[PDB]
Each structure stands twice: as C-alpha cells, then as structure tokens.
Design a protein around this ligand. Structure first.
Ligand SMILES: CCCCCCCCCCCCCCCC(=O)OC[C@@H](O)COP(=O)(O)O[C@@H]1[C@H](O)[C@H](O)[C@@H](O)[C@@H](O)[C@@H]1O
Lengths: 212, 288, 49, 333
C-alpha cells in the first residue's frame, strides 16, 4: 500500500531533518601539515585507511578535523571537495629552517587555490621552543636574504616568518588569516581554534549584514 | 501672542526644504526599493534577511515622502476635510516613527550579529526579519491612536497647527518622547558604539581586521545622522511642550521656540534622504 | 611494456570511419521510435506525466 | 623508443586511412531532432549537502543517490517516496552504484574502500554486506557486473575487478598514469572503459585483465565516460568543455561536441536508449543535450541552483535524472 510507503518516507524525512540542526552548526576544519610539523603531538594534545576525521566539542560547538594523512598528494580538483570547510589549519615546523621554503611553497599552493576562496586560514607555528634554541645558534638570514632585523632576536624572526606566510596569499580581502606560535605543550590550541572560528563566523556575519 | 511673521517665514522655509526633500527622497527611495527587490528576488540566502528590513525602511521613507506634499498643501489653505487632514497627519507621523524604529532595529541586528556571531549565525532567518518588520508596522500604527484626535471636533482643521491641550499633555508627550526618541536613542548609541568597539578590538585576533574598517565608518555614520536628524526635533518638541503647559511665558521665547520646532520638523524629513546614504550606499556600489 | 601494448593496439581490424558512422546511423534510426526522449510520450503512457 | 614511435605512427596512419569521411559529413541526410522539451516531472528533496553521484535501477523506477552529508538515499522516482536512507561511515563519498538485480548498492570515496550494502535483509534494515579494501587512492567510480562481481576505479591510477564474496581483487587493471576518474561498463558485460586524468581513456576486457586499446585527443582530465548503447562506441567529457565520441572499431575520435559559449568542464555524460541524444552535465549550472549524430546542442536542461554533478538515463529511456550541488535531484521528461 502506498500509504505505508508515504508514511515511511515521512519518518525518513523526520530523521533527516533531525540532523539539519547538526549539519548547520558543524564546523569542519581541514588540517594540513608536513611530517616534521608535529601533527601527531598536536592531535594527541587535542585529547584525541584513507583520510582521518576527529570529532570534538568546544563550548557547545562541534568541530570536525579532516586530516588528509598523505592522500592530499592527488592535487586534483575532484579531490578538492573541501570547499565547504570553515577553516584550513596549517601546521608548520618553524624551527627547522631548511624546510620553511618548502612549507611556504606548500602554503602558496593551498591558500591561493580558487576552491578555498571562502575558507579562512589558521596557521600554527609549532616547536617555538626549538625556535629560541635555533635562533641563537644560526641566523635566519642564512636561508632567507629578505630578513632585515637582527637575526638573533626571537620576535623579529617570528614577525618575519608571519609576514613570509602572509605574503604568499593573494586576494587578501576574502577571509581573515590567523597565526599562532605554539610549543609542544599545546595546552591552549582548542581555545585558539575556537576563537579563530568565531572570528571567521563574525566575518561571515559582517559579509551578510551589508556593511560595505 | 504674535505668530504672523514666524508663520510666514516658516511657510516659505517649509516649501523651500520639503520640495527638494520630496523629489529627492521619492527618487532615491524608489531606486532603493528597486535595488533591494532585485537582491531579494534572487533569494540569495545571505542578503535576504538584511534586504527585508532595508525594504521596510525604504517603504517608510517613501510613505513620508508621499505625505510631504499633503503637508505642504493642507498647512497653507484650510481644509473642510477632517478625514483628509487626519489621514495626512497619520501618514506623516507614522512614517517618521516607523523610520526611527526600523533604524533602531537595524542597529540592534548589527550589534547582535557582531557581539554574538554564533547565535546569530544559527538563529537568523528572513522569516524572523519579516515578522519583526510586521511587528514594527503594527506597533507604529498602534501608537497612532493619539493622532486621530489632534483637533477634536474643532472645524479649524488647519493641518499640523494648534493641536490641542490634550495632545500636548504629559500623558501623551512623555510616551511620545521616551518611546520615540530616548529609547531608540539609547539603543542606537549603545549598539553602534559597542559594534565599533568590538570591530576595532579585532586587531588582537588577526591583522586582517582592516578588511572591515569601512564597516566601522558606516556604523559611526549611523549614529551621526540619527543624532542630527532626531535630536533637535524632540528637544524642540520638549520646548513646545513647555510652552503649552504654561512653563514658558515670554512672547519672544514662544516665537523662537515655535520657529525652531517647525524648522526641526522640516529638517528631520531630510532623514528620508540621509537614510539612503548612511545605508543603501555604503554597500559595494548598490548597483543600479 | 609500452612497445607490447602499442603492438597489440595496432593489430586491430579497423573499419572505415564511414562504415562505423553508417553503423551508428543504423543503430540510432533502428531504435528511434522506442526512444522516449527523441519522441516524448503522452501522459497516458508516461509514468512521470 | 623507436619501435614505440613507429607503432604510434602506424596506429595514427590507420586512423587517418579509416577517416575517409566523418559522421558530421554524412549525417546531413537525417532530419535534425530539433529542440527537445524536457520538464521537471519531480524534484527529489532530502539531501543535506551536495550530491556527488546517482545511479538508476534496471527497473527504471528506483534511484540511488550519494551526498556529502554521508548518506545514500534510495528513491522511488515515480512517487518521490524515499525507499531507503543508508547512513555512510565516511561522509566523503564520490561514487555510488546500484546492482542490476537491485539486491545491492555500493559506494566509496576518500576512504579508499568500496562499501557494498545489501538491500534484501530479513531484519528489514540495510546492512553493510562488504567493505572491499585494497585500493590506495580514493574511489572515483563503481559499477556492478552482477551480484558478486564489481569493478572499481580509484585515484591510485589503478582499476580493479573484485569478487564480492571473497573480498579480494579478482584482477587488477593497470596502465593509467593519472587519477582514474570515470568508468563505464559495456552493455554486454565483457568490456569496460575508463577515463583517468591523462587526457586519455583506456578500454579493458574483464576476464583477460588487459588493456585492449588506448584513446587520446583531449586537452585536460576526463571527468566522465559512457558507452554508446550498442557498445561499439563511447563518449567522454573532460574539463576543457569538450565532449568526444570515440569508436572501438575505428580506434580514433569520431566527433567533438563543443561550443564557444561553454568553457566550464563536464561533470557527467549519458546517452539515450537509442543513443541519438548525448546528455552532458556542466559546471555552468545546467545540462546540455547534444545531437550525437550532428554535434548540435539540441536542448538544454536548466533548473538547478548549482553545478550539475550527476546525470543518468533510465534503462527504458523514459526519464533523465540529474543531481546538483544544491542537494536536489531533478527528474526530467
Ligand atoms: C509605540 C510607538 C510610539 C510612536 C508611534 C508613532 C505615532 C506618533 C504620535 C505623534 C504625537 C504628536 C506630536 C506633537 C507635535 C506636533 O504634532 O506638531 C508640532 C506643532 O506643529 C504643534 O504646535 P501647536 O502648539 O499645536 O500650535 C502652534 C503652531 O502650530 C502655530 O503655527 C502657532 O503659530 C503657534 O503659536 C502654536 O499655536
């Protein structure tokens, strides 16, 4: 009887609509980073086979970290099915100078991709402790000739790295970029991620308010 | 006492201000309604909620503009039409305070979206905005009960003149001032100043906060016009109130207060043109 | 491996593009009247209309 | 290297010799189809995100669709009733398939696993029958041969034929250098053809596990592929806004279906039951119906609010279903 089929379709629609309030409030963050960036310790200190997913809650908000653990090497638009994510979170080993250029070369590929035009960028510079050791041993000028401050000051090297990452981003009028300098303790990164996502949602609201 | 020269000079200024105000406001508000109807028709699910109350504000300003010619005409020649005079006064004052309340609601919506971005990003839909617009219409027309009885049964229906001793009573004046200026002034100031503070405080979160620096100026402009459009009138109202309750007695003071009140009421109808500038034109270009 | 693949690919009994074209024409015309998209079906025999 | 060059030259010369005249030169004797009226007979609603794949049943009534909310939905196309709603373990689903018997469905995606679900269970619910693992890249396409044999194409440049009961790859099809995007079985179930991001397609025989022929001509990656109804030809759609009809026998391109005002890539292709209408979905929010024998854009299927990613034609040819990124499936007739 078609009456039973219509009823069953109705309970199916009710079940689907019960998850709309979750699909609309869910924040998906695409996590990128090289093997030396400390992704493992980062995820472990978040209190947490194809690609991986991690589900967690910050202040009654659901976050879903999508970790493309090596399968991002297929740099094709079909794989670039992450245009609906709220943020892209980069992990960069800031202390290991020999690879910053490589990291930058990766950054420029992701943020300037047309797919991620509506995605804000959160940038984490891991192993800041290994920075304060590395800065006093070697000069950042030995790898980047554009540096202008004193190479043995941590703050100047940090601002140089931040501007190096920010300068790889064309079209600086779409979405905000967030940078943080974090160590292996990593005890506050969920708070920082929540703050950056809240600011991204604020930016989207301002876009939606027609203020400019 | 004597009010002849004040009335003649003020009638001249009423024409001189309202005629350009009428034409410019009519044109600009028709363009604004066209543009935001264009935005809504596409059902862009970002611009619909804002476009609904921008349309509401434009409609209220358009109603005020349409009521302006009747105010110019019926205030010079006596009208043996109590119904027409009451209709004109209702259209004028209802449109003015509907614009005030729509502006206040725009500021409340901006402050809510800025201060509570998660909640607003979840619980904000075009149907709620349309419901709030309908509530504004219902409330502004409910507040128009006192304005069917300005002149009472007196046949001297010279529109917008010599209202009554009942209209200028405290029981009507204080609800008019508090719910017409002071409450929206406080809400407007709080929402705009807090939105400016919050959007400026984003320099500690990201270096891309400058992207929204324009969003500062617009909001600040929203205060500046709202203060200049509506502060002098209600203060003016206050002054005239003090005249009608035998608190101010001098003839020169009465003449100056009446002139200032009428001039202020003329100037606040320029708000129907300042609204399409503070809003409606701070967006990208508002492509015509 | 490439040489072997190309060797086996080359050894195929190809037909003229005109002949294959005629075959496609014949198949398209033979089943033309059974195609509900070339000739839309009235609502009396249309399950969606 | 010299032998490879000589073989390529011989193949191209045989292609030129066969190319005495093309279809567009001898099909002038056929009356053009004209301008086709297709209307939205139904609009299937319920998906919470973009729709990436659909597949019709062999009864021409049931329809499976896959969406980014992590769900397959099986619809009755006639009554719009949702027959089933299968939640997926992986919300990153790129393909879905429906068994010719209707007993099973399949899906896959960035999980590198082909999940096969059994629709005929005593308990009355859909249960995960198998999880075919063994592919290294993501899963791009998936097509049942029968209730126990399934062919899957992946982003590891490798295709495979799987025995469902065993769970292991029956045979492996290698030879592509880029990500294999699309897969189409021949309507005799002895051959299939795959498009693999190399501006090239390859034909593979199922039992021998060897690539019979390789076709080239495109400028970009091939996103979609399908066979002509008789199995003697196949059509590809790539990102250069160009459809191409190739012959199995002529070993070369037969037609190019391109137009000046279309520049976006092709997300899907399909044929009609007689094969005269080649339907292709485009990134520009609407589908186009081409006269497969005249390369003329004889119709347009507009009505989606986003990119048309899915396109399928019923086995009887009655209707055409399209799926787009706005979460709505539209049935057209
Ligand atoms: C919940 C929502 C709340 C709000 C809803 C919207 C409804 C608005 C209600 C409107 C209240 C009435 C406002 C009162 C002032 C006014 O309506 O207009 C001033 C002025 O026009 C009157 O002045 P008045 O003292 O009556 O007369 C003068 C001169 O008019 C002569 O020219 C003469 O020269 C002078 O000596 C003297 O007689």
């Amino acid at each position: 009887e078609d009456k039973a089929a219509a009823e069953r379709s109705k309970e199916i629609d009710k079940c689907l609509s019960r998850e709309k309030t979750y699909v609309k409030r869910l924040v998906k963050i695409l996590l990128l980073g090289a093997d030396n960036s400390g992704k493992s310790t980062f995820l472990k200190q978040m209190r947490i086979k194809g690609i991986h997913e991690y589900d967690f809650e910050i202040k009654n908000v659901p976050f879903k970290m999508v970790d493309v653990g090596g399968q991002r090497s297929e740099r094709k638009r079909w794989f670039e099915c992450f245009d609906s994510v709220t943020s892209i979170l980069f992990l960069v080993d800031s202390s290991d100078f020999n690879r910053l250029t490589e990291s930058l070369n990766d950054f420029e590929t992701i943020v300037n991709n047309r797919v991620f035009s509506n995605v804000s960028i959160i940038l984490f510079l891991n192993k800041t402790d290994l920075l304060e050791e590395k800065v006093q041993i070697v000069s950042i000028k030995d790898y980047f000739l554009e540096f202008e401050g004193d190479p043995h000051c941590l703050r100047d090297v940090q601002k140089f790295l931040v501007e190096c990452f920010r300068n790889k981003r064309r079209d600086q009028q779409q979405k905000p970029l967030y940078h943080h300098f974090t160590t292996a303790i990593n005890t506050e990164n969920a708070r920082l991620i929540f703050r950056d996502v809240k600011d991204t949602i604020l930016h989207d609201n301002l876009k939606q308010l027609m203020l400019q | 006492c004597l009010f002849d020269g004040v009335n003649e000079l003020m009638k001249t200024l009423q024409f001189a201000v309202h005629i350009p105000t009428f034409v410019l406001g009519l044109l600009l508000n028709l363009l604004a309604i066209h543009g935001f109807s264009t935005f809504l028709k596409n059902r862009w699910p970002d611009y619909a909620a804002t476009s609904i109350y921008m349309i509401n504000l434009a409609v209220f300003d358009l109603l005020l503009v349409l009521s302006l010619p009747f105010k110019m005409v019926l205030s010079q020649v006596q009208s043996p039409f109590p119904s027409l005079c009451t209709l004109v006064e209702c259209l004028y004052f209802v449109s003015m305070y509907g614009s005030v309340f729509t502006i206040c609601f725009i500021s409340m919506d901006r402050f809510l979206a800025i201060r509570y971005p998660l909640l607003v990003s979840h619980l904000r839909s075009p149907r709620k905005i349309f419901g709030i617009c309908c509530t504004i219409w219902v409330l502004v027309w409910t507040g128009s009960i006192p304005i069917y009885s300005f002149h009472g049964k007196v046949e001297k229906y010279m529109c917008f003149h010599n209202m009554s001793d009942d209209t200028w009573s405290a029981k009507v004046f204080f609800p008019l001032e508090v719910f017409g200026f002071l409450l929206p002034m406080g809400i407007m100031g709080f929402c705009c100043s807090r939105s400016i503070h919050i959007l400026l405080g984003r320099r500690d979160h990201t270096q891309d906060w400058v992207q929204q620096k324009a969003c500062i100026y617009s909001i600040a402009a929203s205060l500046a016009v709202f203060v200049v459009s509506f502060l002098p009138v209600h203060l003016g109202f206050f002054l005239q109130f003090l005249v009608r309750n035998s608190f101010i007695v001098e003839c020169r003071a009465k003449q100056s207060i009446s002139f200032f009140l009428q001039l202020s009421m003329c100037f606040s109808n320029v708000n129907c043109c300042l609204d399409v500038f503070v809003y409606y034109f701070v967006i990208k270009e508002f492509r015509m | 491996k490439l040489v072997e693949q190309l060797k086996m690919e080359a050894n195929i009994d190809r037909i003229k593009v005109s002949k294959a074209a005629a075959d496609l024409m014949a198949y398209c015309e033979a089943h033309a009247k059974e195609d509900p998209l070339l000739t839309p079906v009235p609502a009396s025999e249309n399950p969606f209309r | 290297r010299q032998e490879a060059e000589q073989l390529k030259n011989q193949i191209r010369d045989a292609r030129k010799a066969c190319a005495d005249a093309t279809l567009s030169q001898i099909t002038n004797n056929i009356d053009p189809v004209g301008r086709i009226q297709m209307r939205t007979r139904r609009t299937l609603r319920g998906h919470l995100a973009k729709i990436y794949a659909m597949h019709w049943g062999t009864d021409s009534r049931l329809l499976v669709s896959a969406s980014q909310d992590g769900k397959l939905i099986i619809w009755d196309s006639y009554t719009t009733n949702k027959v089933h709603a299968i939640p997926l373990r992986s919300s990153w689903v790129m393909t879905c398939a429906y068994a010719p018997s209707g007993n099973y469905v399949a899906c896959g995606g960035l999980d590198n696993i082909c999940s096969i679900y059994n629709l005929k269970t005593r308990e009355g619910n859909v249960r995960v029958s198998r999880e075919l693992a063994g592919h290294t890249g993501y899963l791009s396409c998936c097509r049942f041969l029968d209730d126990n044999q399934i062919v899957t194409s992946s982003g590891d440049t490798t295709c495979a034929l799987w025995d469902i009961e065993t769970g292991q790859q029956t045979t492996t099809f290698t030879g592509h250098t880029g990500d294999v995007m699309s897969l189409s079985l021949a309507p005799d179930t002895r051959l299939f053809v795959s498009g693999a991001c190399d501006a090239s397609a390859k034909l593979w025989d199922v039992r021998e596990g060897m690539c019979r022929q390789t076709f080239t001509g495109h400028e970009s990656d091939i996103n979609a592929i399908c066979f002509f109804p008789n199995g003697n030809a196949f059509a590809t759609g790539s990102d250069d806004a160009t459809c191409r009809l190739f012959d199995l026998r002529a070993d070369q391109e037969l037609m190019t279906y391109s137009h000046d005002n279309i520049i976006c890539g092709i997300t899907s292709v399909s044929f009609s039951k007689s094969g005269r209408l080649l339907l292709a979905g485009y990134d520009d929010f609407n589908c186009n119906v081409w006269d497969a024998l005249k390369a003329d854009r004889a119709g347009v299927l507009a009505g989606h609010d986003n990119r048309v990613s899915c396109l399928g034609v019923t086995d009887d040819g009655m209707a055409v279903a399209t799926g787009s990124w706005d979460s709505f499936l539209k049935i057209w007739n």
